[PDB]
Structure 1
Amino acid sequence: PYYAFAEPFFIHAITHLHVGSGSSVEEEIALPFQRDELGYPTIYASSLKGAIKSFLLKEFPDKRDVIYKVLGEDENPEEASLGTFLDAILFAIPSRIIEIDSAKPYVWVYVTTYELLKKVKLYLDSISQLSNASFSNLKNKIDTILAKEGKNITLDSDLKSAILNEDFYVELEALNNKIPSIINAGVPLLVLEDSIGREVINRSLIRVRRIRIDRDKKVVETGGLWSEEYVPMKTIFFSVLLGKESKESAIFASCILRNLRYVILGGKETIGKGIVELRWVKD
């Protein structure tokens, strides 16, 4: 009742992403990403809901009724919304790897920590039997992983040693013998210790300096230089769409959602920094 059904999904970044927060963090960045309490990037539920709402209002410019029912209304005449988003928690950021003693060549891997999988488990178990879906095949894998907490774990491969992001030497260990990978990709996944993970990850985040040029002399304008922070292409965020049951959800979550693969998240889309892909956890 009142969230009788739930659908989780992965937000797989197709291009770099910027979801701003002003100048919200004490950092060397002028336009940082949206941070968690642990400083990991996240996508607030407001941004996620607003972006998907705006997208659906133009990709199905006739279902205004259904989208306005589920994702709420804009004008003052309103009524209780009946589908909500949870903040997108970062799942796995990409990482350049130089593997020592491995003949399976890998130029990049996915990197997680245990802090992150803790929250992913918090989301997944809070739905598993609370709602009427079957995601044991994933919550149990994450539980297996969190069992080995404290040490750098490599999944679905055997590397035993690697240099991550060209600056960090880690020594891995296979989980048991192998675990059926949790992403259709073939890229390995590494669940690093929380201490070195938040360095490898802050090394994966793109932090560029941008310039504003004076046209009549092609020289930078004074005070025309700032720094941004995108999250790399191929990054993966995780969140859930929590929906009540009011005969619009039966339509929203059945034909609107079946058609969604790509949406645009966050700002700077003229720089092409918003394309992202939604894979629903149904595989």
Structure 2
Amino acid sequence: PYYAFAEPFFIHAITHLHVGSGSSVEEEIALPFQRDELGYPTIYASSLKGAIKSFLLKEFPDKRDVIYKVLGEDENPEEASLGTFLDAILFAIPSRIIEIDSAKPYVWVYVTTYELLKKVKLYLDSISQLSNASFSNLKNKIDTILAKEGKNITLDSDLKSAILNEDFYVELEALNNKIPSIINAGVPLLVLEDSIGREVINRSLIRVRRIRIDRDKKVVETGGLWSEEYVPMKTIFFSVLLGKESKESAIFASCILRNLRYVILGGKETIGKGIVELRWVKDVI
């Protein structure tokens, strides 16, 4: 096999999030996020592994040997790693909402589209045949949702209509079943058609103008003006930590990963960005 077990997990942005990519000038930001191939935000597996590696080496300074085994070395780039991350897949971005004669009044909802769920199902289905990863309720819900493709669907059967991010009017309909809350927030999840979901999601991302100021006369410096995208709080990405069979891998997964709730991802940590809560999909859902 040589990938013996896989642990899926979610990634909830606690603060805003900036995992950066190649700065350029064509997309009129200056510093975007990491688009996958469909323009959705995604955390590359390299960024995930590196950030988590650094966090763990700082936190558990003794297991440095175990961490260097599972995640790899840097002074001995001879033996490969026993563990890998998949690129974090955007799962549900939070969107603002204005209810339209709907029972429970919400001011924000989670939003997904159908490509995002197709990729999530790809991951789950692919890792399912490992005899350790069952969680068949999860892919059950994903599949019953994907069956209803082509319609703005809501996993809370009361909205029936909404305005998302103060610009997009979507007329919803319920999944004809209850399909219990995938993400344990008390907030409805909305799966939208792809064309409109991309609009809603691109408008859910934060875009900030930033400046550098001279400390003397409090006036902006020349050329000191740019902009950058953050992924909002509350955002959920999905990935899997694939491991091989060894016993450093076992000791890793048994005590490194039991105690790994919050992690620092991406850049701009001094600005506060990058805090993240890792939810292991073996207890929730």
| C-alpha distance in 2 between matches for 1:192 and 1:236 | 16
Tell me, what secondary structure is at the counterpart of 2:101?
A: coil
* Cα deviation 1:96-145 (Å, max 9, x = unaligned): 00010113010100000001000000000001124532121111110000
| C-alpha distance in 2 between matches for 1:228 and 1:110 | 23
Change (3 A) 1:117 1:223: same
Q: Contact 1:4 / 1:131 at 8 angstroms: preserved in 2? A: no
Describe how 1:134-149 pairs up with structure 2 within 5 A: 134-149=134-149
Q: Contact 2:94 / 2:110 at 8 angstroms: preserved in 1? A: yes
Tell me, what secondary structure is at the counterpart of 2:258?
A: helix
| C-alpha distance in 1 between matches for 2:243 and 2:109 | 34
Q: Contact 1:4 / 1:132 at 8 angstroms: preserved in 2? A: no
Change (3 A) 1:242 1:200: same
Change (3 A) 1:39 1:24: farther
Tell me, what secondary structure is at the counterpart of 1:250?
A: helix
Normalization by structure 1: what TM-score? 0.98
| C-alpha distance in 2 between matches for 1:210 and 1:252 | 41
Number of the residue aligned with 2:77: 77
Q: Contact 1:25 / 1:32 at 8 angstroms: preserved in 2? A: no
Q: Cα distance, 1:15 vs. partner?
A: 0.3
Change (3 A) 1:143 1:74: same
Q: Cα distance, 1:24 vs. partner?
A: 5.4
Tell me, what secondary structure is at the counterpart of 2:229?
A: coil
* Cα deviation 1:2-38 (Å, max 9, x = unaligned): 1111100001000000011122583111000011100
| C-alpha distance in 1 between matches for 2:243 and 2:70 | 8
Tell me, what secondary structure is at the counterpart of 2:141?
A: helix
| C-alpha distance in 2 between matches for 1:10 and 1:258 | 15
Tell me, what secondary structure is at the counterpart of 1:227?
A: strand
Change (3 A) 1:25 1:122: farther
Relative to structure 2, which stretch is displaced further, 189-198 or 173-182?
Answer: 173-182
| C-alpha distance in 2 between matches for 1:158 and 1:117 | 22
Normalization by structure 2: what TM-score? 0.97
Moved over 6 A (4+): none
Relative to structure 2, which stretch is displaced further, 15-24 or 49-58?
Answer: 15-24
User: What is the percent sequence identity of the aligned residues?
Assistant: 100
Q: Contact 1:6 / 1:131 at 8 angstroms: preserved in 2? A: no
Q: Cα distance, 1:157 vs. partner?
A: 3.2
Q: Contact 2:103 / 2:158 at 8 angstroms: preserved in 1? A: no
Q: Cα distance, 1:176 vs. partner?
A: 1.4
Describe how 1:174-185 pairs up with structure 2 within 5 A: 174-185=174-185
Relative to structure 2, which stretch is displaced further, 115-124 or 129-138?
Answer: 129-138
Change (3 A) 1:45 1:129: same
Q: Cα distance, 1:261 vs. partner?
A: 0.1
